[PDB]
Design a protein around this ligand. Structure first.
Ligand SMILES: Nc1ncnc2c1ncn2[C@@H]1O[C@H](COP(=O)(O)OP(=O)(O)OP(=O)(O)O)[C@@H](O)[C@H]1O
Ligand SMILES: [Ca+2]
Ligand SMILES: [Mg+2]
Length: 526
């Protein structure tokens, strides 16, 4: 609020502070025709502002660093201490101070936007975050994606985390400091700050705080989950884990169910709760007949990123020539059917693992055993494209601050206490070399949530030993068995053996505990 207050963080000579801009103020700030470069917004015919995020159109895990100090040394899952790969690269406190002078100097003597907000729907576990930026649309991003405080909550607002966005500065000493590049996304848990240099991508702030929630919550016994969530009229809660592009936002935004959130949730003694106040949807080749809710949320106060807007202001949603990662964020009340005023609900009884399998091996749906649930949670499989595999522990290893086993343990405890069941859903590819359609996927989710799948007759799919139904109301029976989508079942066999090998090698790192070694029997077997 006052310059004396920003000076505590290291920023000086700030004349104009814009505290908690309203949506109307951000709209005017973004459309100021005097803006230059990547600060500029343009109005689209849908009424929503669109921006260009610059060189970076996604996260930069190679530039992510965590200060290694006595607070984090023995608790963090470090990239250099084994046994599993992750992006939590250690940083010295000395280099941290250098990066902090870079960002604070860049922000000094600027018009700064400051946004106070919450991460976490429950007062007992939420972080009070203070975001500092010089770009209006960046402030708009965090206004959309975090929980917007009431007037009364601003009154006594006490930040316990600061994120300073120094996107316009770069680090010229990076080669001497052993870093990946002149950009940086740095975290210091002793100071409780995130610094961002060089990249304008707003997702770094969203996932920065998620990584911070992923550090603190499981240490209190609370699951911290990379998943969307919604609840039926009968009060039944479902969560949908998955890696990028697998359908968390697409498939949780069903107007029969009340949306809880689309990306980040905790699970405590009272149930599943959203960390966020908005949604962040992929728009590449957006249909509108396939995703009407998401489409109609694109209006004033939504923020489009990197989409092509024509001279007449209309949007070419099919154009990925800047990036396939085109995006729109919006506050969650742009969705008509949501839980409100607080984004939370009871304990989940359906746990869905979304995966997009470019190898075309995995069945569209399968009810997992309790051990297959752990095996597939720790594996975190998806594949892209020709197919390249990704194994990302807990379906979100980019954001884990603790060891994967820690997340697995908390999830199992919550699931067992609630009597929850888990399901593996391939929203990716089959023998057709096409992605299964959203229509067919939505019907499969319906069969999961309404008990149809639990009461179906099943057989065991070989190799992966996954229980699959012979038929389901609403679904093409042909696709339920992935072997039928090839001309010869021997074609599937060949790819299943390839994929099973990748799973087996990947899981080996978990077999150094007796419990992990016993899970190998739940995995695929050659
Ligand atoms: N059968 C399907 N089920 C779900 N999504 C599908 C399907 N086929 C294609 N898609 C596309 O996949 C994308 C899913 O985007 P979505 O925002 O749901 O990703 P996400 O899982 O939330 O990941 P991110 O965290 O990157 O946003 C959309 O572009 C959607 O249209
Ligand atoms: Ca994601
Ligand atoms: Mg999404």
């Amino acid at each position: 609020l006052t310059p004396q207050e920003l000076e505590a963080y290291g920023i000086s000579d700030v004349h104009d502070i814009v505290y908690n801009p309203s949506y109307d103020l951000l709209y005017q700030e973004e459309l100021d025709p005097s803006l230059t470069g990547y600060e500029r917004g343009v109005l689209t015919n849908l009424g929503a502002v669109a921006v260009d995020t610059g060189i970076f159109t996604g996260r930069s895990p190679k530039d992510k660093y965590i200060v290694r100090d006595d607070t984090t040394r023995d608790t963090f899952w470090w990239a250099d201490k084994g046994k599993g790969k992750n992006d939590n690269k250690p940083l010295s406190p000395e280099t941290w101070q250098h990066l902090k002078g870079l960002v604070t100097r860049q922000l000094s003597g600027k018009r700064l936007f400051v946004v106070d907000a919450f991460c976490g729907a429950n007062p007992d576990t939420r972080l009070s975050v203070r975001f500092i930026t010089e770009v209006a649309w960046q402030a708009h991003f965090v206004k959309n994606m975090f929980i917007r405080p009431s007037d009364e909550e601003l009154a006594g607002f006490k930040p316990d985390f600061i994120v300073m966005n120094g996107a316009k500065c770069t680090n010229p000493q990076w080669k001497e400091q052993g870093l990946n590049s002149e950009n940086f996304v740095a975290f210091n848990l002793t100071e409780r700050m995130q610094l961002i240099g060089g990249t304008w991508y707003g997702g770094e702030m969203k996932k920065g705080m998620f990584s911070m929630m992923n550090y603190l919550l499981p240490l209190k016994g609370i699951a911290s989950m990379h998943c969307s969530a919604n609840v039926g009229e009968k009060g039944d809660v479902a969560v949908f884990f998955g890696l990028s592009g697998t359908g968390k936002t697409t498939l949780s935004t069903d107007p029969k169910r009340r949306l809880i959130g689309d990306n980040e949730h905790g699970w405590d003694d009272d149930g599943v709760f959203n960390f966020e106040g908005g949604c962040y949807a992929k728009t590449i080749k957006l249909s509108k007949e396939a995703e009407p809710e998401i489409y109609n949320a694109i209006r004033r106060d939504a923020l489009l990123e990197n989409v092509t807007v024509r001279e007449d202001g209309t949007i070419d949603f099919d154009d990925g020539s800047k990036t396939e990662n085109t995006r729109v964020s919006y506050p969650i009340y742009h969705i008509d059917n949501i839980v409100k005023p607080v984004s939370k609900a009871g304990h989940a009884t359906k746990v869905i693992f979304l995966t997009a399998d470019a190898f075309g091996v995995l069945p569209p749906v399968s009810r997992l055993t309790a051990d297959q649930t752990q095996y597939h949670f720790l594996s975190g499989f998806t594949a892209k494209l020709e197919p390249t595999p990704t194994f990302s522990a807990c379906f979100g290893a980019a954001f884990l601050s603790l060891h994967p086993t820690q997340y697995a343990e908390v999830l199992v405890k919550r699931m067992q206490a609630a009597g929850a069941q888990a399901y593996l859903v391939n929203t990716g590819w089959n023998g057709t070399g096409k992605r299964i359609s959203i229509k067919d996927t939505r019907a499969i989710i319906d069969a999961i949530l309404n008990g149809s799948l639990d009461n179906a007759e099943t057989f065991t799919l070989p190799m992966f030993n996954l229980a699959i139904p012979t038929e389901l109301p609403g679904v093409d029976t042909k696709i339920l068995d992935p072997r039928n989508t090839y001309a010869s079942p021997e074609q599937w066999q060949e790819k299943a053996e390839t994929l099973a090998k990748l799973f087996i090698d990947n899981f080996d790192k978990y077999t150094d505990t007796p419990a992990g070694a016993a899970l190998v029997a739940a995995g695929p077997k050659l």
